[PDB]
Structure formats: C-alpha cells, structure tokens
Design a protein around this ligand. Structure first.
Ligand code: DGL
Ligand code: DGL
Lengths: 255, 255
C-alpha cells in the first residue's frame, strides 16, 4: 500500500531503513521538517503544533497510514494527530514497549531509556513501561547525541567524551537500553562498546531499535507480507531544501 | 528611539547584553525564532525566508531600526531583508569588520573567524575582511559549540575536547579571533584559555565580540549618547514558548 512517514528531519531515515528492509509498502511518502529540526530541545505546545501541521502535509498525498518515525513527535503529538485523522497514525514508542514485553521477561531487569529532553521529560516511556510491570527503569536525556550524529561524529575522542559525560552519573548498569530517538541507532555499537568497556562486560546490554520494533508491530497488526513488493517507490519532501534532505537519505539508508 | 532585535533564539541575548550596558535605547523589542532554532545548520533558501518572516513579525511593532543579532541571519538574509524594508536593518558582520579595522593595524595579522556552518559557508566574513585589505584569514565552522552552549556545557572535559576537536587542525596560531556567532561570548574565556594554555601564551588572542561591535557601530553612526534609561522597556517575543525564552535570559545577561 501507500503510506506516509513523518520525522523532524533526516533522523527518521533510521526507521525508513527498517521499513524498506521489511518490504511492507509499495509507495512511501517521507516528509522531514528539516527547516525546524530539532524538536527535542523545544516545548510541548510547539511540538504538538508541529505534529498537527505534519498532518496537513499528508492530507493530499492520499496515504493509508502515517508513521511518526520521530520519537519526540510520537511522545508529545501522537495523541492529537490521531484525534484528527481519517487514517491510522502509528508512533515509534508504543511498538517498542511491545518489543520489550517479549524480549525482556524479568520485570526487575535494569532498563535505561535514552531520548531527547522533550521525550524524557514527557515520561512517555516511563509510563508505558511501568504499566507493563517493569520496576527497574531509568531515564536519560542525551541531547548532544543528536547534533553530534548530524555532524557525522560517529566515533573518536569527542563522541567517547560525550557518552562518558551522559553515562557517568547513572546509578545502575543497564541490562537493556532503549534507543528512544531516531538518531541513536547510528551510534548503537559505540553505546554497546561504552558499557562493555567501562564496566568490563563479556556482552553488551540489549538495545531496542525503534525502527525494528515498529516493523514488528506493523507486520503483526495491518498484517503484511515480508516482501509484498519488489521495488518500492519513495518520495522525499522537506520544509527545508529537499536536495539537502535527499542527500542525507543516501548516507542513512546505506547499509 | 524604539528598536527591534532579531535572533534565531536565545543566543541573541549576548547582543542584548551589550545593548543594555551601553544604554542607547529606551525601548527594545526582542524576537527569537525559538521554534525553528538553529539556523546555522540549514540552507540559504530556508534562512533567507526566515529573515523575511522576521520582518513580518516586526512590522506591526513599528520599530525604527532592526538589529539582526544573529550572525547566520546576518550572513545569509541581510541583503534580502534590507531590500524589502523601509527601516534601517543592521547586521552583526560589517560592524565587526569596522572594529577590526580599528584594532588590527597589521593587515598581515592572523585572524581566525568562528561561526556556524552556514555563516562560514557564505564567506561573508572573508569577503568583508579582504575588502578592508586583510590578507591572513582562517575560517572555522564550530557547529557543536552552539548546542553545547545551549545545554550550558561551559566547562569540563566535554567542552575542552570539543574545542580541541575544532582547533587542533588549525595551521596558524591566531592573533585575532572573531566570535562570529551569538553564542560564543559565553565560552570566550574558555577559548582564550585554550590558546594561552596550548601555546604557552602570556596573553590571549584578541577576541572580537559581535554584540559590542554592533553597539559601537550604532553608537557612532547615529551619534547616540549612553544616557537612555538604566532599566529600559524590554519586550520578549518568541515563536516557541516565550516562557522558555525568557527564563534563559539570565544565562546571558548574567553579570
Ligand atoms: N527525531 C527526533 C530527534 C531529532 C529532534 O530532536 O527533532 C527524535 O526521534 O527524538
Ligand atoms: N544565532 C546563531 C546561532 C544559532 C543558530 O544557528 O541559529 C548565530 O549567531 O550564528
């Protein structure tokens, strides 16, 4: 079918990479609000309005389903967007909760949630996780990860120092880490390397990928074949220069 | 005289600080496009439109002069803005050149220009400096400085490492450093310390402050006295939550 994917910028490509891999949809209309990104360092009122405005962008595209690839938008504007919609709107938060429920049996397992300041402040993951019984949960806003990753600073001294800055105050060694942000998958191995090295772990904690989770959810609900289509057509749209956004699509979608 | 001050967000408070200290105007209308900050990591077309939209916001306020405190907006949209406006519009680039002309007699003195990617990409400083005869200029886009500063990372290993990441590749030790971004004054002492420490200098390179430079230019161009109210009328406006914008002011107006 034909669907739309919404994100604040190019981070949502991490989710698009997953969606493509699953070969679930024939046509995908991706819209990145690159003129206003990032959303994570802003307020609830502003983000909700951005969410509603994303709706207006897709209305004429005739999409059968809208994926809010942005973790920040999913945590603050999903509710409203759905209230006003003739079609289904799926965020990347709830699907990750389901991924945890089946991947993390022990309700006492230490879980660390990483996200933007807005996503963490919303308690979106904390609320959802507790409902499912989990009692050992920790939350951490790692905002500088976003700009570092957009500068393509995916390794080296600076990145290590930034992770050390954010992770040092942590009280509990996580057994599971949720990548509650579109950009974090790009430094997944680095995050794993940090904990394995700093805490001398034989194996890294478990990381939950937002894109892979929403895929598992969309394959279940809205039942879809794992190759219901050959070459999916994709449209790229942005509030900023679309050429700049498309250029990054190459880098993010690349294996 | 009633004036307007435009910036992409809270960074412009560094210019507001200079304006307030000089006591030139009795009324100042501050507008920060906080819903869309930052401008520096975006494209020319997007930035130019933001500039024109800033003019639409100010038209109703009937200001007599508009200060574009944003170095990025100054570099990319100043020309377009001045074209469709009947009131004088002053950016923070030219005043800096005029201040350098006066402080640096040696046209061969090594000058280092720091700014956002968009500001540096525009070559606005390069072209303005050469016109005045300067021949030893280096340009560096220190993008990460912006988010670091907004998270108030003004000390510690992360700031040192970020500074080292950008500065270490420099082939020449600057004698003059242009803080070509609203945010940099907040780490001015740290930058001075970096060069004094790393190059065993008894005194730091001369830093050019955008805010003081435009205030000085304004003071002379309009022959203004420093006798305006000690506590003038200041209005704060923002595209994002204005409460968030205001609460940040003390971080910049501080002492
Ligand atoms: N896409 C956002 C990260 C970038 C932003 O702050 O807008 C998220 O998933 O949280
Ligand atoms: N105000 C911008 C810094 C923040 C931004 O990029 O928007 C400048 O002076 O270049």
């Amino acid at each position: 079918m034909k669907i739309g994917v919404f994100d604040s910028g190019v981070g949502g490509f991490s989710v698009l990479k997953s969606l493509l891999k699953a070969r679930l949809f024939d046509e995908i209309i991706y819209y990145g609000d690159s003129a206003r990104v990032p959303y994570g360092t802003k307020d609830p009122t502003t983000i909700k309005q951005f969410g509603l405005e994303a709706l207006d962008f897709f209305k004429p595209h005739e999409i059968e389903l809208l994926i809010v690839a942005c973790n920040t938008a999913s945590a603050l504007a999903l509710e409203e967007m759905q209230k006003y919609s003739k079609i289904p709107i799926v965020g990347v938060i709830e699907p990750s909760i389901l991924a945890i429920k089946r991947q993390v049996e022990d309700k006492n397992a230490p879980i660390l949630v990483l996200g933007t300041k807005a996503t963490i402040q919303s308690n979106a993951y904390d609320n959802a996780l507790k409902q499912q019984g989990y009692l050992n949960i920790s939350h951490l806003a790692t905002s500088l990860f976003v700009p570092l990753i957009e500068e393509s600073i995916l390794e080296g001294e600076l990145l290590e120092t930034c992770m050390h800055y954010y992770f040092t105050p942590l009280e509990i060694l996580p057994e599971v880490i949720i990548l509650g942000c579109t950009h974090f998958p790009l430094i997944a191995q680095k995050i794993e390397g940090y904990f394995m090295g700093h805490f001398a772990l034989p194996t890294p904690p478990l990381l939950i990928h937002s894109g892979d989770a929403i895929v598992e959810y969309l394959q279940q609900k809205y039942a879809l074949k794992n190759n219901a289509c050959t070459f999916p057509k994709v449209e790229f749209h942005a509030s900023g220069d679309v050429i700049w956004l498309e250029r990054q699509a190459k880098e993010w979608l690349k294996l």
